[PDB]
Amino acid sequence: ATTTTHELNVSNSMTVGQYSSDFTLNGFTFITGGSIWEVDSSSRSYGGVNFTQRVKSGGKGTISKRAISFTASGAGQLTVYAMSSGSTSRNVTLYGNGKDLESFTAVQDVITAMNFTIPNSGTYVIYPPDDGISYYYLKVVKTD
Length: 144
Hints:
Keywords: Carbohydrate binding, sugar binding protein
Protein name: Pel9A-like right handed beta-helix region domain-containing protein
PDB class: sugar binding protein
Subcellular location: Secreted
Helix content: under 10%
Family: Belongs to the polysaccharide lyase 9 family.
Number of helices: 1
């Protein structure tokens, strides 16, 4: 039994553009570290859902650059739909409790569904350590 507490479908909650200052949307905080966050058109499907926009990091980053953070009120699961923005496989890393906790490989051309464990309440950071990542969908689910 779980409760969905955060959701961000980029196709429904963002619009095409370029953003250079940190902002919060649907409970997710987009952290520039002096780079641009960009929303553009990109059609990809996963699990019977069709997406039409992505938010892309524009390159590699850290927990303070091209990062996405959120605060969880308890243990649960974070879902990330992500694609490498180029032809090489690239990590998406979850940071929390003071450390890199878990990484998931994003591949070229298609969405990977990434299921990240949220072990406890707190603030967590999604970042791309290798190179640019395209994000389509984020969801946080809290264990009841």
